[PDB]
Structure 1
Amino acid sequence: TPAFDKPKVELHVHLDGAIKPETILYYGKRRGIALPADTPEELQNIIGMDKPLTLPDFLAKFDYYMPAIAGCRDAIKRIAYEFVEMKAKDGVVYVEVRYSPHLLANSKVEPIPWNQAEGDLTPDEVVSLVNQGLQEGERDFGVKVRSILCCMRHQPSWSSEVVELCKKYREQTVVAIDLAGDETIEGSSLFPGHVQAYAEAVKSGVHRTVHAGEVGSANVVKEAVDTLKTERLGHGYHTLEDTTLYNRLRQENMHFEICPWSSYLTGAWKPDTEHAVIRFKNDQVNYSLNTDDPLIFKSTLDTDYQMTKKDMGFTEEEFKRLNINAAKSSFLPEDEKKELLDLLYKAYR
């Protein structure tokens, strides 16, 4: 019934769109914040979409619930532990999971998100708290888990507190820096706070990932590669608009973090046309399959493989190939990965 019953790797999914309805009220309703609702069953259908909204429709979704968990310590650790638990029900042996500390914070961060007031919920406490619930999740649900912390494009002021959090919490449990948010902002990749954060990353050996080529042209993908020095791309569908960049990522073994079901609802991929991942799969690309914002997309990893089985023709050696290139591209330290790759060869034949 589920498209591909075997174990899985996932590398692109955001904490703060992978929170449950239910604990959206429990913190919501405890905290009064208060929502479009009071059933734990109909947040879901409002802050979950069915069809391609726009950018502002989309960010406004964050506005109802985010203010219910950010700010409250209890809920930062809650959503950590509960996240691990979804991945095991999805049949995932390794997940890298991501988020911005700033967006959980309530103290120590200009500007203050989600309209909230002051506080003592620090950015650094947020990372502390997330690590926790992540770890109790590896031990309870038996998924191995690392995190990535996420620069916001519009906010290059944060970025250096970012790379530094990434060296503070190194291995316990953060493996990488990300860049995200809205790739529309002209020359965002190239803001000095973004560039120096990634340079520092290189200096002190944090890994690197970048969201690019999703709603954004190929030149944003070339700046992620050549200036920011990433080792993998968040999405990168626009790489195909630029063939020489292509042939070279293809020659370089770049890994692309695909969200196919995300690519519909966001507008990244058009209904009429070519699917980026079919092409990437006719060309034997280094890519992976990924959920992204499962709240907001009303979905599970099975949504994604279903789609790919049930339209774009995926055999199941695809499925296996792609989960192999995924733990190959992972940001596990070198023993750890060989160990993961083991698990998966055992399971796959």
Structure 2
Amino acid sequence: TPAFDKPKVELHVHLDGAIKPETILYYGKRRGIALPADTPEELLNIIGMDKPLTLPDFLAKFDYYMPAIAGCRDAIKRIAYEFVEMKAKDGVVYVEVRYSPHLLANSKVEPIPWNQAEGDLTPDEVVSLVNQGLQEGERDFGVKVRSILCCMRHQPSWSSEVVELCKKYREQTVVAIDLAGDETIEGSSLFPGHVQAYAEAVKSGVHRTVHAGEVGSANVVKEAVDTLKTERLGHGYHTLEDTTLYNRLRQENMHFEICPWSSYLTGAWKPDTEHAVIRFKNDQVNYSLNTDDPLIFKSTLDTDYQMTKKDMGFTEEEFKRLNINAAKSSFLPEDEKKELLDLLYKAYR
């Protein structure tokens, strides 16, 4: 069933884990990269999940397939292409994708990932691939893509870099810096490299967001809002613990990015206790429903929206209004945003 059928907005997703089993498959068996499987479903059935695991675990599923794709120059622009694809197939007019240059290489990179080998490929290029691949994909699917570049919790050394990336790819196609990776690393969201790079962001314009919340304490969010300056909270579930912090973001007017089906699956949730998502709906705080990782969880944007009208009862009347908010919170000029607001507005309504 539809389950929401008007033209959606989406803010939280990762390139990384918006690949199809096939493009993996190709490259494993093409530049040779001994892969973990064969039948395109078996690939899926190692890569993805169904019993709720733990955030740490989630995060090394990734080590299964990435080698495949990592630099090869080729693949960057192709999996950027096929990703815009999926985003016009399930219902979306507007997406922000995130990703991590650092995972996507090759050269420089003194902790060299997966682990793999030297090296044409740079941060400076593994972006300018994607911008074409989301510019193309845009061109050919009806959907406008802007990307988000992700600092990455466990490596502060690299965070510095991403701000220079964002600044200078700024609009061709990047509208933002993020923080991503294991919440459990005690202290991570404060380490010097991160705050330094966020604050070259606020010192220099760059829009900010942080996965804070999810599977770690309310503190990690309090850090994120106040020390890092996060313009919107990447998940923000555990902010319902410090219930005076909670009234302070409801009050600041600020985006929670929920990821339903993701929540059960990483660990951020016990299925015995009402998910933060229905709460935000009761309180009417600006949230956005969302996908996070299509591949690793075996899903589609319909999966969230349907976990949400049938388990946790959701009017269409809500869906309407969250998809207006997400648009309101987008990292896109008031320019581009009056007119993506004119879209869903004269179509919901």
TM bucket by the smaller chain?
Answer: over 0.9
CA contact (8 A) 1:29 1:38 kept: no
CA contact (8 A) 2:36 2:64 kept: yes
Deviation of 1:58 (Å): 2.3
Between the aligned partners of 2:97 and 2:256, the Cα distance in structure 1 is: 16
CA contact (8 A) 1:22 1:41 kept: no
CA displacement 1:221-255 (0-9 Å, x = unmatched): 00110010011011100100011111010011110
CA contact (8 A) 1:11 1:290 kept: yes
**Residue 73 of structure 2 corresponds to which residue in structure 1?**
73
CA contact (8 A) 1:213 1:237 kept: yes
Deviation of 1:60 (Å): 2.8
State which drifts further: 38-47 or 234-243: 38-47
CA displacement 1:208-230 (0-9 Å, x = unmatched): 00001101101100011001001
Q: Secondary structure at the match of 1:184?
A: coil
Deviation of 1:101 (Å): 0.4
- Provide closer, same or farther for how the CA distance between residues 55 and 236 of structure 1 changes in structure 2, counting only shifts above 3 A: closer
CA contact (8 A) 2:166 2:206 kept: yes
CA contact (8 A) 2:36 2:65 kept: no
State which drifts further: 57-66 or 129-138: 57-66
Structure 1 gaps, min length 5: none
**Residue 217 of structure 1 corresponds to which residue in structure 2?**
217
CA contact (8 A) 2:84 2:138 kept: yes
RMSD: 0.9
Structure 2 gaps, min length 5: none
Between the aligned partners of 1:221 and 1:325, the Cα distance in structure 2 is: 21
Q: Secondary structure at the match of 1:95?
A: strand
- Provide closer, same or farther for how the CA distance between residues 343 and 65 of structure 1 changes in structure 2, counting only shifts above 3 A: same
Q: Secondary structure at the match of 2:157?
A: coil
Between the aligned partners of 2:224 and 2:81, the Cα distance in structure 1 is: 32
Percent identical pairs in the alignment equals: 100
Deviation of 1:64 (Å): 1.8
CA displacement 1:156-203 (0-9 Å, x = unmatched): 111111100001100100000000111111111111110110111011
CA contact (8 A) 1:149 1:162 kept: yes
TM-score normalized by the length of structure 1: 0.98
**Residue 95 of structure 2 corresponds to which residue in structure 1?**
95
Between the aligned partners of 1:62 and 1:185, the Cα distance in structure 2 is: 18
CA displacement 1:16-64 (0-9 Å, x = unmatched): 0000101111111102212222222221122111111234532331112
CA contact (8 A) 1:52 1:267 kept: yes
TM-score normalized by the length of structure 2: 0.98
Between the aligned partners of 1:39 and 1:346, the Cα distance in structure 2 is: 45
Q: Secondary structure at the match of 1:327?
A: helix
Between the aligned partners of 2:57 and 2:36, the Cα distance in structure 1 is: 15
CA displacement 1:107-159 (0-9 Å, x = unmatched): 11020111101111111110111111000011100101100000011111111
CA contact (8 A) 1:258 1:287 kept: yes
- Provide closer, same or farther for how the CA distance between residues 304 and 87 of structure 1 changes in structure 2, counting only shifts above 3 A: same
